[PDB]
Amino acid sequence: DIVMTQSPDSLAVSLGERVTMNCKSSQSVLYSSNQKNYLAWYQQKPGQSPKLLIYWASTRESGVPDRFSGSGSGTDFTLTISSVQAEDLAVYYCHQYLSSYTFGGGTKLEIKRTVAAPSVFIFPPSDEQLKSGTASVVCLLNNFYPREAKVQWKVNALQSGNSQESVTEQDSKDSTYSLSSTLTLSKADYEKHKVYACEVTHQGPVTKSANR
Amino acid sequence: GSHHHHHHGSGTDITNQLTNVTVGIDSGTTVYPHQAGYVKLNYGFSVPNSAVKGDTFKITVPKELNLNGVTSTAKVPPIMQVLANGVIDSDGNVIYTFTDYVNTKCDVKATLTMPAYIDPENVKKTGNVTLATGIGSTTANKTVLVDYEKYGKFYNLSIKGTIDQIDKTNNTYRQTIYVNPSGDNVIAPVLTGNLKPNTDSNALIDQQNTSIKVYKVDNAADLSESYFVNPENFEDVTNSVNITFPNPNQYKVEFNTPDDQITTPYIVVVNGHIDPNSKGDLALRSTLYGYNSNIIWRSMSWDNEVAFNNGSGSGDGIDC
Amino acid sequence: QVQLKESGPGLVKPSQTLSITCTISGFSLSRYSVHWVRQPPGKGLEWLGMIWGGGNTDYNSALKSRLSISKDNSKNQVFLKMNSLTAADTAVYYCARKGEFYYGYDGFVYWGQGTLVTVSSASTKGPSVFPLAPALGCLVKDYFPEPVTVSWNSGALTSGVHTFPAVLQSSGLYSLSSVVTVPSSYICNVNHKPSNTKVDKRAE
């Protein structure tokens, strides 16, 4: 199995600048006899099928803009965007077709902006819900950048497992993210404690706590 | 021990002093090189007490034959304590150099048998061939039919293949495949190269180990029946076909023409490797898939296996 | 124009067989190979296998035991079958086809829009809607399947609205949080088509 690995998982771009993405193969994809590199690059937007941009490493697919080019040979390859546009915000995957078919893990483009701290909120379990005998504590980080954020719950006792989080897509007019973390305990367990905490570290260490 | 590096020195060619000389060629009335057919070259001779270390004799072998066959390098057998070691010269002749055994032995006599094979470059066509081998003034002739027979064919799908240059030290082999030698029209032609099913085979077939060249034959008459191919006679279209390695130890070639059909033969030359960590069995299957005019999907496949032979040589004598 | 469209079930239980259909136009199926490729939510792509024009198939080695691909040229249909399913087989399934000869290889140029298959044992259930009290939010918990649609004040509180991607709980049910930033003196409008549910909780 030829394994395809892409180096930067996420990439922050300035609309207009030169973005390069790396892709690497665990064995050479240049077949020596025909001197061809069996490598393709694909673009994908969130609800759509992938779109071929580049094949044979450097052959631009018809219809694709001239700002996209591909280079490399053997085991190291690069997808370039000469100057990034609004529509270029997407995921990019490389792919080899010499030895069956395999894909890389991809590189997401996001818009770069200045650092911005989350405003942190906590919300205890509602009384209505407690009637269902199940307790959800919700911690919210609103409008922050970059995405990398460590949320940790204290119940002064670290909670390993028992939480789930999701993050919004970057805001189209702010370039900012949003995160909601849900800690779920049983009723018995929630009623046996007071002073729960949502501690949140970021690059912009604040704890937002409530007492039962 | 390499056949590309020879050593000489003191000694004299005592070929014409060989006494009681007899030569023979053991074969059927027909030889089928592509069915592992071969001949045996037989030799017997008395050596003079006069002989000393370094004295040589020459066995004359004809250009219609070689001694290596499917392997890339020939090994001539030692006459046996070693009486004589031999070597192949640029003409194809076998020069044997006598050992020390002859420095203190008298009335020495010897026998030799060597497998030999119809050479693909010198016998390109099916037909009769008079084989001549000898030692000094004693030549033996045998006239034999060399029959390379026919390619395989099912509906409009024709294919045959040969294996040679088996090199069990550098772990390589060659395979030469004629695709559509019948001069049929084939639509959507696909060739796959595999290991022969349920047979011990040590070929490693993959992008690192398997170099493939594809030649288009615009004149089928230029094809040898022996499967000797010189790439300079044909058009190299390697870069216009699709060559991939879609499964373990399998290659695939799509001819990929603009109208998705071929009307001429193609030659596929495969230079591949043998698994170093193995006995080095070589059993391959070449499959031609294709549509006819009726668009019924069919395939014809050709299997290649090989055999190996060893010559021998014995000699006696008496202490003086 | 060359076209491909995948149809299948939306939901399939782990006891069952996944059965997808790829309906083809603009070319003859007997003259082109068609591929199957899949993509789990938020992950990369995985080739599953292919059927040649002539009917041969090749499979991804890691799934061949669980996978069968077949077709009917008569009907322009290509079929995918998968048994022994787990949550790991929840994915968007695509069929795809190569470009014309001059591309020089058999790959993925024309794609279908894809069809989501989610493997799940859950039954249809409506969400519980709980208020996240004063930032004001609604906790939409324990529903199946997706999606939930959320509004604020019948669609007038559009600004500052953050309605997050649902998360799949270990129970097999989904939950999501929807939030709005405010200064105070207020109702989230939650719908969920497949259970004929509609809720409207208020804010404290």
Cβ distance B110 to B86 under 8 Å? Answer: no
Q: How many CB pairs under 8 A join A and B?
A: 30
Cα–Cα nearest to A40, from A14, A84, A77: A77
Q: Note the Cα B220 to chain centre separation in Å.
A: 23
The string over C144-165, giving b where at least 16 C-beta atoms fall within 10 Å of a residue's C-beta and e elsewhere, is: bbeebebbbeeeebeeeebbbe
* CA A154/CA A121 separation, integer angstroms: 15
Structure tokens that stand for B239 in this block: 């870069």
Domain boundary among A78, A112, A146: A112
CATH superfamily of the domain spanning C124-204: Immunoglobulins (2.60.40.10)
CB B284 within 8 A of CB B304: yes
Structure resolution, Å = 2.4
From CA B301, how far away is CA B10, in angstroms rounded? Answer: 56
**Which residue is associated with the tokens 């989080």?**
A165
DSSP classification of residue C166: P
CATH architecture observed for domain B149-320: Sandwich (2.60)
Instruction: Write out the H or E segment, with its range, that includes residue A191.
Output: helix A187-191
Tokens 């390697």, located at residue: B238
Number of domains in chain A: 2
Peptide bond connecting B258 to the previous residue in cis, omega within 30 degrees of 0 = no
CB-nearest to A33 from B206, B212, B247 is: B212
As a whole number of angstroms, the distance between CA A37 and CA B33 comes to: 40
- Touching B (3+ Cβ pairs <8 A), the chains are A, C
Q: Where a domain ends, among A84, A112, A140?
A: A112
Task: Out of A112, A146, A179, pick the residue that ends a domain.
Answer: A112
- With contacts defined as CB-CB under 8 Å, which chain A residues touch C43? 105
**Claim to verify: residue A23 and residue A93 sit in the same structural domain:** yes
CA C133 remoteness from chain centre: 33
Q: Which residues of A touch B (CB under 8 A)?
A: 27-28, 31-36, 38, 97-100
Domain CATH number, residue A134: 2.60.40.10
C149-152 sheet: strands from edge to edge: C149-152, C187-192, C197-202
Nearest alpha-carbon partner for B195 in B269, B255, B248, B266: B248
> Which chains neighbour A (Cβ–Cβ under 8 Å, 3 or more pairs)?
B, C
Q: Which chains would you list as touching C if contact means 3+ CB atom pairs under 8 Å? A: A, B
Residue ranges with strand state E in B7-120: 19-26, 30-31, 39-46, 56-59, 65-66, 84-88, 94-98, 105-118
- What residues in A contact B211, CB-CB < 8 Å? 32-33
* Residues A122 and A95 both lie in one domain: no
* Chain A interface test: which of B174, B192, B207, B270 (most A C-beta within 10 Å): B207
| Domain(s) of CATH 2.60.40.1280: residues in chain B | 1-148
Residues of C with CB under 8 A from a CB of B: 30-31, 52-56, 58, 101-102, 104-106
Method: X-ray
Cα(A156)–Cα(A137) distance, rounded to whole angstroms?
16
In which residue are the tokens 């240049």 written?
Answer: A30
- State the residue range of the domain holding A99: 1-112
Q: Which helix (H) or strand (E) is C96 found in, with range?
A: strand C91-97
- The verdict on a CB contact (< 8 Å) between C53 and B297 is yes
Q: Where are the domains of chain C?
A: 1-120, 124-204
Smallest CA-to-CA distance from C129 within A212, A189, A126, A137 is with A126
Q: How far apart are CA B116 and CA A165, in angstroms?
A: 78
Question: Do C153 and C186 meet the contact criterion of CB atoms below 8 Å apart?
Answer: yes
Query: Do the chains contact at C164 and A178, CB–CB below 8 Å?
Result: yes
* A119 CB-near residues (< 8 Å, 6+ apart): A141, A142, A143, C135, C181
Which fold is adopted by the domain B1-148? Answer: Immunoglobulin-like (2.60.40)
For residues A118 and A165, the answer to whether their CB atoms sit within 8 Å is no
How far, CA to CA in Å, does C191 sit from each of A136, B50, B117, B207, C200? Answer: 21, 113, 85, 55, 9
- Per-residue tokens: C171: 């129970």
Complete DSSP assignment for B94-118: EEEEE-SGGGSEEEEEEEEEEEEEE
Comma-separated ranges of CATH 2.60.40.1290 domains in chain B: 149-320
- Across A86-99, b (16+ Cβ under 10 Å) vs e yields eebbbbbbbbbbbb
Cross-chain Cβ contact B247/C58 below 8 Å: yes
Structure tokens at B272: 């591949």
Mutation target for C interface from A1, A101, A185: give the one with most C CBs within 10 A: A101
Task: Using an 8 Å CB-CB cutoff, list chain C residues near A33.
Answer: none
- Portion 82-111 of C in contact with A at CB < 8 A: 94, 103-109, 111
Record the tokens describing residue B213, joined without a space: 């060249």
For C188, the token pair is 């989230």
- A123 contacts C132? CB cut-off 8 A: yes
**Is the bond preceding C145 in cis, omega lying within 30 degrees of 0?**
yes
Rounded Cα gap, residues B125 and C202, in angstroms: 95
- The backbone torsions φ and ψ at residue B20, rounded to the nearest 5 degrees and listed phi first, read 45, 50
Q: In what order do the strands lie in the sheet with B127-135?
A: B30-31, B138-146, B127-135
User: HSE (CB half, 13 Å, CA atoms) of A150?
Assistant: 5
* Phi/psi of residue C57, nearest 5 degrees: -130, 150
